[PDB]
Design a protein around this ligand. Structure first.
Ligand SMILES: [Cl-]
Ligand SMILES: [Cl-]
Ligand SMILES: [Cl-]
Lengths: 267, 262
């Protein structure tokens, strides 16, 4: 006659988190406002902290909160910041664990996911991109996989770039990359190209894309080329005559030593 | 392939249960709480969770809320309140014979329909001649139609037995009245019903003697032996002091003689 029975409402948790989301959409009981530029987003601290440890540190007072709880978001990759509909989607994801990712928003979702330590969401963006990987976007994708540490994705995109190196060079996407990547690539032994001569034509184009902030990297890039692997003809007829090479003595020196090596290896 | 896909849906199937779980861990540490329930001891909680659990809290749109007095003065047991609170956050709760009544009251007060319906099945399976009265009382006090009927049937079939226990005599007037109005109750004689009314009144002369007349009118005197009517009913103080009652006994005795010539 003694007994205790456990009652478990199977849908209860989903319903709870969905109603808190409907509450968020009307501002009900919200105690924190995420400000981006600008556009403001209300939410509940309890939910944010539950979704990610990223927000737990806001108890101590590690956020610049106005007296009505406003937190300002550090600038992002794009000045304007992520798209309003995309932020709303990531915030709603924190409340419900559901989100629709598209080719158009995947990059911003990835940035927000990375910024908020949303591991699962970030891993998902990784599979999404992994399945969309294609010669026409491997560069743009490798760039992201790197910027957001997506090991798996990185390798895959890197292989496609190696095998098709001679191709990615005629398209203008490649020339929008940042210096540290261009550098890593010239340092890559595996890249498949017809001649080292191409790599020199590539560096010129990368620099000529934005003379201003790029001409200052030429020398470090130039030192990465293997001149001993280029035809003496090209070395003296196209390399040495080039302005960026002539104006820099360390460079002209390098060309001369290379030409000297060629004659010495003449056996 | 995939070279055409423009979007995809993601759903982390365990997200919500983990979410509601961590908000429970927070509640227990007083983290991010923004409201306080009072009965006494105080309970911290989040308004967003409360409102999401039940519409009972929506109309309250770090302030303390005080809970209206309950059935028992001291109020529900601390461990029971905490369990109902945790239920709101997780949808899981352990109900026992010892706490079920207080869980029912809290569930009813907060409009936790599913919880309330559960307590109803729990009680329905524990229904027994030894508690049908206490249970019928609850099923009624909290509108448990199903439970009410079942407990009512058990009381009817054994009315002769329930009258002998003492629990029965603690019921409120409106229930005693409803029972004397019941045609189905199984008793040996209407005489017992008279003895029962006396005891109910004698239990608390003060606030009860004022109901005697309305109860007395519910008895079917025409069904009692003339012996008893004149020897035990009429001589009784409560009957004698009330003219409307002595009148009724007289008419009954008269009916008996009229129905006696055939
Ligand atoms: Cl609003
Ligand atoms: Cl894409
Ligand atoms: Cl009844």
């Amino acid at each position: 006659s003694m007994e205790a029975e456990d009652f478990e409402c199977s849908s209860h948790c989903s319903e709870l988190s969905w109603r808190q989301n409907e509450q968020r959409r009307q501002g009900l009981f919200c105690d924190i406002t995420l400000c981006f530029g600008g556009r403001e987003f209300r939410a509940h601290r309890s939910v944010l902290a539950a979704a990610t440890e990223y927000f737990t540190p806001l108890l101590s007072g590690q956020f610049s909160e106005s007296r009505s709880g406003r937190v300002e978001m550090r600038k992002w990759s794009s000045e304007p910041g992520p798209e309003p509909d995309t932020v709303e989607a990531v915030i709603e994801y924190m409340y419900t664990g559901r989100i629709r990712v598209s080719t158009g928003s995947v990059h911003e979702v990835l940035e927000l996911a990375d910024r908020f330590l949303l591991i699962r969401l970030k891993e998902f963006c990784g599979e999404f991109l992994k399945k969309k990987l294609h010669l026409s976007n491997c560069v743009a994708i490798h760039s992201l996989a790197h910027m957001y540490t997506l090991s798996q994705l990185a390798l895959k995109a890197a292989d496609m770039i190696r095998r098709n190196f001679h191709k990615v060079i005629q398209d203008e996407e490649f020339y929008t990359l940042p210096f540290h990547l261009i550098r890593d690539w010239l340092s890559d032994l595996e890249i498949t190209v017809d001649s080292e001569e191409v790599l020199f034509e590539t560096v010129l184009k990368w620099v000529q894309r934005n003379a201003e902030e790029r001409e200052r990297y030429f020398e470090e890039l130039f030192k990465l080329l293997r001149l001993s692997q280029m035809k003496p003809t090209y070395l003296t007829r196209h390399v040495k005559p080039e302005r960026l090479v002539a104006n820099n003595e360390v460079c002209v020196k390098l060309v001369a030593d290379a030409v000297e090596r060629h004659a010495l290896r003449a056996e």
